[PDB]
Amino acid sequence: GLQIKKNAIIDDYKVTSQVLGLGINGKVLQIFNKRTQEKFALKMLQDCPKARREVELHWRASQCPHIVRIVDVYENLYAGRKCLLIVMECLDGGELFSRIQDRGDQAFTEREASEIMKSIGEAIQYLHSINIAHRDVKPENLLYTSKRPNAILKLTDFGFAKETTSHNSLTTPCYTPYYVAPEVLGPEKYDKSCDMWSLGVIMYILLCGYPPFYSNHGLRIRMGQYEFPNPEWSEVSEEVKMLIRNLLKTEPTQRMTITEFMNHPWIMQSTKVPQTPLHTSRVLKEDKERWEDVKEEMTSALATMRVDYEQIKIKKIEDASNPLLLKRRKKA
Amino acid sequence: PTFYRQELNKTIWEVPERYQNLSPVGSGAYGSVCAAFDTKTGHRVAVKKLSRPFQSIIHAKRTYRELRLLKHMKHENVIGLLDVFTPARSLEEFNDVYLVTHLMGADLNNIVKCQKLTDDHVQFLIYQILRGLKYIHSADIIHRDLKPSNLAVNEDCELKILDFGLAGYVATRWYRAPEIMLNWMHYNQTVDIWSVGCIMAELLTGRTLFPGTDHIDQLKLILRLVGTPGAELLKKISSESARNYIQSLAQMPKMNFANVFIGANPLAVDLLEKMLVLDSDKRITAAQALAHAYFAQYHDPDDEPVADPYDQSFESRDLLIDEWKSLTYDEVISFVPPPL
Incomplete structure (x- = not known):
């Protein structure tokens, strides 16, 4: 090609x-x-x-x-x-969040968030449909095509992208044994599912200005425990919340797929979307360096959510040798 | 003592000439890492450039802490230090700290998703995690954030423990013990033993034990396995808001783990039952675990060393940024390579 x-x-x-x-x-x-x-x-x-x-x-x-x-x-x-x-x-233009950061503030409204999210979901919908996963959708890879209002949002950086299998997934059933099933290994299940998780996390920052992540210090809330802390989330529709939640589903197969996403009314009907303002622009202002930590953890989280196919396999145990392994086997 | 600039990982890497072929690796999350060939020694090694080392007192202190540890950590199963350097020629130019560690090139996070592990794999893997744990606890250190992506493993099966700097944001707490999560009780070194339990569970199953969303969902899963607390342990709980959530709960007794993990080497289901326990004071210790039956192939009292604990040379001596950036600086030049 x-x-x-x-x-x-x-x-x-x-x-x-x-x-x-x-x-x-x-x-x-x-x-x-x-x-x-x-x-x-x-x-x-x-x-x-x-x-x-x-x-x-x-x-x-x-x-x-x-x-x-x-x-x-x-x-x-x-x-x-x-x-x-x-x-x-x-x-x-610069990063997406650096923009919203800087404002009149002409206020940041929820329908803007919806367009911005319809944008990214188009980018992602395009990829998945021809069978590519980006697998690194985060803030530093969403940039604008200029500093003007007529600027288009673009997705960059394919260092991690990879082709995957288009494979309709186990709609995991309502009744299940107490006991833990045998894992069927199938890494390709973390590919597309990783961009959906991304989609969730960004959409969440978009509507409040802080990650759904936990904090180190334990339970002025600037970390949703995967919850929606008032006031910011007070006004945001509860339909939006159900969205963030299907996207952040812990389980890769159970989690929302991009076409289910593009159908969701809050994206599709991006335009009759409630027009409420959001605290995003203001909070993002708040502490600068705290954003820097949002970015570092998003990146580390993406890193565990996706498969490094460039990694070594472990020998069958018997085929292995090393110092400790040779000391112990000796005495065994 | 001479370097050479290169463009790696949205940074600028000036590093000694002995390290060639810097090829970026890892997420670049907390410090970025590059694989390398080390001419002076013929070996292949990792080279991580710490991020935003002296941006805050939170960060500045955090870096001096982290350095202090790694200089004193000497052990087959904890990540040892191979060199540390810095392109600055004196405290003024000081801004960056680079670590060099031995290259491994897989972590259990990623292995568990590509490979079905055998019982023998799990015996030897968890054995090694416990060996370094024992050593670490000795130094009186609590790892605090032990997870599968913190455990570097290579193909000839050696395991090493990584990344201490919690000894910010975390995206999930699937591996933290409930003590430290809702801060009821206060905590043993056995917090770490809780993680080890979850990790072992995951190796044996290929699935994550407590994949929870919010702190309640996470807590509701933990309890679904280990049963709700009894008045015994609830007494030992701190909060008021915490005790009440428990009672507000359908009180359930611990279902036997051999009923859950069907087809596990029974000796291991048993060691599980002694790690994933809700009461801290009654959770098995790193040392005691090694002497457990599971690890019959590998247990050797005569070769499970401990560390000579080190001090608090400053640590909490509260200082400005320009302060730490100097204490750290000293720790950097003070460094002597381990045995060639």
Whole structure:
């Protein structure tokens, strides 16, 4: 599908030194197309099979309106290392929550939240339907296409995306034994289910300005114990709450799927949605560094909710050897 | 003593030249990590760059705590320290702290979802968790946040314990003991033993024991297994609001665990019954557990060392940020590599 160009990228783009920021494998630089002088952004990855899959999948995703568009993909040597240079639609606006943060405040209303969430759910609906899970939907990957009001919200960063099996799930039954069943291993069940969990957690922050997470210090509430603390959640409809809850269902198979989500009235009928204001903009202001902790834990939680397929398997126990294992077996 | 900048994990990694091939790994949640080849030693190792180390007194203190521990933690089954460095040339330039640890490359969080573990797997895995636990408790440390994603395991089956800095936000408490969750009683080192129980349960089953949502839903699951408290233990409870929730509950007795985990090595169902117990003072200890039958293949009194506890060199000596950023700094330069 995608054709990767083999020429020097400098042939085509003036590769500026000014910096757009810092990523995982890449320091992203601003660039310009020579012929057309449009402005873009260049992201680098080291060229291996992991990098080519992120590349491939994010290619396929680029046809979606709410996913950041890949414009071109070069393979050049950069300082003697193979690399995929990836050229991307510039994303001016900044993170989603940094925006809502800054306000007149013209007030932040619940229907805005609904549009913002219909946006992301389109991005996610697109992916799942052609069988891709992003698996890393969080605040730092939802960026705006400019600082203007006419700005579109885009989903970026496929470092973790992967294709999965479209596989209708066990609608887990109402009556069940006291005793614990044998686990049927099937990792592919954490793929799409991870973006639904994401969808929940963001939607929750969107409507109050703080995570559904617990706190370390134990039971001025700024952490929903997966509950909806008044005043912020006083006004928010109870239908919305049922949503957040089906999305945050602990169980991957039991948890809400994206089309069930896109049908939900609070998204679909995004427009006759109660227009109540929300404390989000204000709370987000409140403590700056506390947001920073929201982001760190969202990231760690995503990390356990999804499967690292790039991990070692344990030998059958007998096939194993190590120091302690050889001391004990000796004496046994 | 010379470094080299590189762009990793939305940061800027200047690190000594002995560590090549930095390839990012992990979530990048709490400090980011990169795998590496260590020329000077020929081994493969991990290199984590702490995040926001000196942003607050909460954070500053938290970093000095964490460093102090890792410098003193020496043990086969707790994560040992291989080096620590810093690109600053004197307290002023100080801003970043990097750890280097031995690379392992899987944690039970992820293994439990890709592999069906055998009883022999579980014996040896939980054995190792208990070995380092015993050692840790000795130093008088309470791990406090022991979960499957905190336990690094490699393929030749060795296990190591990670990540102490609660010894903020947490997304679930599926592994914390009810004592520390609703703070009724106050707590033993046996809090950790509660987690070990849940972990073992999950290894044997492949399912998480108490996957709860809110603190009540979580609490209602715990009790569904271990039965509601008796007036005995309720006496030992702190709160008023806490006692009443209990009585307000359909009072149920503990169903025998051998009825629940059908097809488990009975010797293990038994050790479960002694870890997942509601009363702290009566919960089995790390030491006592090793001597349990399950671990017959692996128990060896003569090789289950303890640590010589270390102090409170400051810890609670309440100081400004520019303060800790110096005590930490010292701990950094004070470091001597372990035996080559």
